[PDB]
Design an enzyme around this catalytic site. Structure first.
Site, PDB file in Angstrom:
ATOM      1  N   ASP A 191       5.309   3.955  -9.009  1.00 40.94           N
ATOM      2  CA  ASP A 191       5.109   5.243  -9.687  1.00 40.94           C
ATOM      3  C   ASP A 191       6.370   5.749 -10.389  1.00 40.94           C
ATOM      4  O   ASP A 191       6.806   6.871 -10.143  1.00 40.94           O
ATOM      5  CB  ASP A 191       4.642   6.313  -8.691  1.00 40.94           C
ATOM      6  CG  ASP A 191       3.412   5.870  -7.885  1.00 40.94           C
ATOM      7  OD1 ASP A 191       2.511   5.193  -8.470  1.00 40.94           O
ATOM      8  OD2 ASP A 191       3.376   6.196  -6.672  1.00 40.94           O
ATOM      9  N   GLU A 247      -5.757   9.348 -13.302  1.00 40.73           N
ATOM     10  CA  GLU A 247      -4.546   9.877 -12.614  1.00 40.73           C
ATOM     11  C   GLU A 247      -3.371   9.608 -13.562  1.00 40.73           C
ATOM     12  O   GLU A 247      -3.600   9.362 -14.758  1.00 40.73           O
ATOM     13  CB  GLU A 247      -4.360   9.163 -11.243  1.00 40.73           C
ATOM     14  CG  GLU A 247      -4.213   7.601 -11.347  1.00 40.73           C
ATOM     15  CD  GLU A 247      -4.246   6.852  -9.979  1.00 40.73           C
ATOM     16  OE1 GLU A 247      -4.433   7.492  -8.932  1.00 40.73           O
ATOM     17  OE2 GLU A 247      -4.131   5.607  -9.962  1.00 40.73           O
TER      18      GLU A 247
HETATM   19  O1  LIG Z   1     -10.401   0.194  -8.722  1.00 43.21           O
HETATM   20  C1  LIG Z   1      -9.094   0.239  -8.192  1.00 43.21           C
HETATM   21  C2  LIG Z   1      -8.600   1.690  -8.072  1.00 43.21           C
HETATM   22  O2  LIG Z   1      -9.343   2.419  -7.114  1.00 43.21           O
HETATM   23  C3  LIG Z   1      -7.113   1.802  -7.758  1.00 43.21           C
HETATM   24  O3  LIG Z   1      -6.765   3.207  -7.890  1.00 43.21           O
HETATM   25  C4  LIG Z   1      -6.241   3.802  -6.716  1.00 43.21           C
HETATM   26  C5  LIG Z   1      -7.349   4.629  -6.056  1.00 43.21           C
HETATM   27  O4  LIG Z   1      -6.861   5.300  -4.910  1.00 43.21           O
HETATM   28  C6  LIG Z   1      -5.839   6.189  -5.105  1.00 43.21           C
HETATM   29  O5  LIG Z   1      -5.315   6.634  -3.828  1.00 43.21           O
HETATM   30  C7  LIG Z   1      -5.797   7.903  -3.427  1.00 43.21           C
HETATM   31  C8  LIG Z   1      -4.889   9.016  -3.947  1.00 43.21           C
HETATM   32  O6  LIG Z   1      -5.340  10.287  -3.487  1.00 43.21           O
HETATM   33  C9  LIG Z   1      -5.354  10.452  -2.133  1.00 43.21           C
HETATM   34  O7  LIG Z   1      -5.844  11.740  -1.811  1.00 43.21           O
HETATM   35  C10 LIG Z   1      -6.209   9.410  -1.457  1.00 43.21           C
HETATM   36  O8  LIG Z   1      -6.016   9.520  -0.065  1.00 43.21           O
HETATM   37  C11 LIG Z   1      -5.790   8.004  -1.904  1.00 43.21           C
HETATM   38  O9  LIG Z   1      -6.644   7.034  -1.346  1.00 43.21           O
HETATM   39  C12 LIG Z   1      -4.668   5.682  -5.948  1.00 43.21           C
HETATM   40  O10 LIG Z   1      -4.016   6.814  -6.499  1.00 43.21           O
HETATM   41  C13 LIG Z   1      -5.024   4.682  -7.079  1.00 43.21           C
HETATM   42  O11 LIG Z   1      -3.903   3.878  -7.488  1.00 43.21           O
HETATM   43  O12 LIG Z   1      -6.312   0.977  -8.527  1.00 43.21           O
HETATM   44  C14 LIG Z   1      -6.710  -0.399  -8.565  1.00 43.21           C
HETATM   45  C15 LIG Z   1      -8.144  -0.522  -9.112  1.00 43.21           C
HETATM   46  O13 LIG Z   1      -8.563  -1.859  -9.322  1.00 43.21           O
HETATM   47 NA    NA Z   2       4.392   9.789 -12.569  1.00 40.94          NA
END
Ligand SMILES: O[C@@H]1[C@@H](O)[C@H](O[C@@H]2CO[C@@H](O[C@@H]3CO[C@@H](O)[C@H](O)[C@H]3O)[C@H](O)[C@H]2O)OC[C@H]1O
Ligand code: NA
Ligand SMILES: [Ca+2]
Ligand code: NA
Length: 487
Positions: free
Chosen positions: A24, A225
């Site tokens: 990040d 995001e």
């Molecule tokens: O399809 C896949 C995506 O889902 C992946 O994206 C991630 C999805 O989960 C995210 O994590 C959440 C952030 O917010 C919090 O409140 C939750 O507890 C977490 O689980 C994360 O931000 C993403 O990177 O990326 C890969 C794709 O193939």
């Molecule tokens: Na950032």
């Protein structure tokens, strides 16, 4: 020299670092240097010592590196941001926060002094800020609770209140962009995938540690995001990671960096296109895109992440991420060209001056060492040292300029139980030997002396290799900083 590079090979600029991870990434440009701040990805292990997938358990620090030249990175170690629960052994700064994900960084001159502001997400529910008087700390929590929560005006509707991006406009007004997630819980409708309406912008107060008014929704099509904001030729560019669900049109491809423009920082924004493919399109890859666009020494770049270090170590990325930078090109019409993400990365911008004190933890390539916080007296804020040095390991700097007169001697600040050697070589790890520094037993790993030795034949511009040798089977010495003297 026996050890090999993990992923960042000699002559290449990506990943920026490979002696540890960093996810990040975001960039601050400040007074001739670019600082990269990162989530603290850190290998997690099963009870039998085997590696497991990243669960984000350890995302409670922010890692910081900086460069004047795009190739040599100074490791500034880790900010112990999260202070809740166990985090950071009681040393955590933000006592209310168990996590510090996805940093953003800003500088603003307040009362004639530059002040720095580090923002982070306490997982998915709240943005925090720390302040400091230098880009590397020390840091203060001036609020003691989140800056932004679901109760902040305009923030209801946000599914994941994270991935902050903070921008200080030309008039000095700060703005915070944040949010993402997709409404509809387990099965969003097609329309929920296409218009999550979960991205927000809110104006910051003058102090950069408060908000003014309410947040506006940015209707980023297929929002996921990774908010970002840069300003080019008077236009504001809101960029973000496009989600992976639903059907997508050809112009909004899943998992890629989309962007929108407005003549105002809070909108209205209009979708214009996309400029960075999924990391797995280039490095395969795996997994999520995270990015920030910035101008450093008058050129446009994007910093982003890929799973290129864990990939090389394990044969799978496993959710562990590393920073990369490539150039970014705006067209005459204001559109942005597809970024050509790669390993070569950015060609070194300026030479390194070897006659100042240079941190040992300032290097371009290594095989294979670690950096950690140092016990060495003096040194810069959060001074680190190079450690985990075994026989055959080495570090190297890109394009040190010895000048036509060249160097007379080499000084190194070292700590050692049993002693060893530092060979100084030009161009390659087996290259011209210009000096050999004998590191004595000093008292042990926390007892320091600066040692000098002669150098000959060091002139002009060269990669410089510091090759570590010794009879031990583990760590030979710790290495804090070095300096050459002019002939
Ligand atoms: O399809 C896949 C995506 O889902 C992946 O994206 C991630 C999805 O989960 C995210 O994590 C959440 C952030 O917010 C919090 O409140 C939750 O507890 C977490 O689980 C994360 O931000 C993403 O990177 O990326 C890969 C794709 O193939
Ligand atoms: Na950032
Ligand atoms: Ca140091
Ligand atoms: Na090592």
């Amino acid at each position: 020299a026996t050890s090999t590079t993990i992923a960042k090979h000699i002559g290449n600029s990506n990943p920026l670092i490979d002696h540890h991870l960093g996810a990040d990434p975001v960039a601050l440009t400040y007074n001739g240097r670019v600082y990269i701040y990162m989530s603290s990805d850190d290998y997690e292990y099963n009870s039998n010592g085997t590696i497991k997938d990243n669960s984000f358990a350890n995302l409670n620090r922010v890692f910081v590196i900086s460069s004047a030249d795009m190739v040599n990175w100074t490791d500034h170690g880790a900010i112990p941001v999260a202070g809740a629960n166990g985090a950071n052994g009681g040393r955590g700064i933000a006592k209310w926060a168990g996590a510090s994900w996805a940093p953003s960084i800003a500088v603003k001159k307040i009362n004639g002094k530059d002040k720095f502001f580090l923002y982070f997400a306490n997982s998915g529910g709240g943005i925090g800020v720390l302040t400091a008087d230098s880009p590397i700390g020390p840091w203060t929590d001036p609020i003691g609770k989140p800056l932004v929560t679901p109760s902040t005006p305009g923030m209801s509707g946000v599914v994941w209140l994270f991935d902050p991006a903070v921008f200080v406009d030309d008039d000095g007004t700060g703005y915070l962009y944040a949010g993402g997630g997709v409404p509809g819980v387990s099965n969003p409708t097609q329309g929920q995938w296409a218009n999550p309406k979960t991205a927000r912008v809110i104006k910051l107060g003058p102090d950069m540690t408060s908000v003014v008014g309410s947040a506006s929704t940015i209707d980023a099509p297929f929002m996921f995001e990774d908010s970002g904001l840069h300003k080019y030729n008077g236009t504001y560019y809101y960029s973000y990671c496009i989600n992976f669900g639903g059907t997508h049109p050809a112009d909004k491809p899943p998992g890629e960096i989309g962007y929108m423009t407005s003549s105002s920082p809070m909108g209205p924004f209009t979708y214009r296109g996309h400029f960075l493919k999924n990391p797995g399109a280039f490095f395969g890859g795996g997994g999520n895109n995270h990015h920030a666009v910035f101008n450093f020494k008058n050129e446009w770049y994007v910093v982003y992440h890929a799973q290129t270090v864990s990939s090389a170590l394990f044969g799978a990325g496993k959710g562990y991420r590393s920073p990369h930078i490539n150039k970014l090109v705006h067209n005459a019409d204001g559109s942005i060209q597809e970024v050509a993400a790669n390993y070569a990365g950015v060609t070194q911008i300026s030479n390194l001056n070897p006659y100042n004190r240079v941190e040992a933890e300032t290097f371009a390539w290594n095989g294979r060492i670690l950096t950690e916080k140092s016990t060495a007296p003096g040194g810069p804020v959060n001074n680190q040292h190079v450690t985990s040095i075994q026989n055959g390991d080495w570090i190297a700097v890109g394009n040190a300029d010895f000048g036509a007169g060249g160097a007379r001697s080499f000084k190194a600040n070292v700590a050692s139980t049993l002693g060893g050697k530092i060979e100084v070589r030009l161009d390659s790890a087996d290259g011209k030997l210009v000096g050999t520094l004998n590191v004595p037993s000093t008292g042990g790993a926390q007892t320091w002396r600066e040692i000098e030795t002669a150098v000959s034949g060091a002139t002009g511009v060269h990669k410089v290799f510091f090759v570590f040798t010794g009879t031990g089977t583990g760590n030979l010495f710790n290495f804090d900083y070095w300096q050459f003297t002019q002939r």
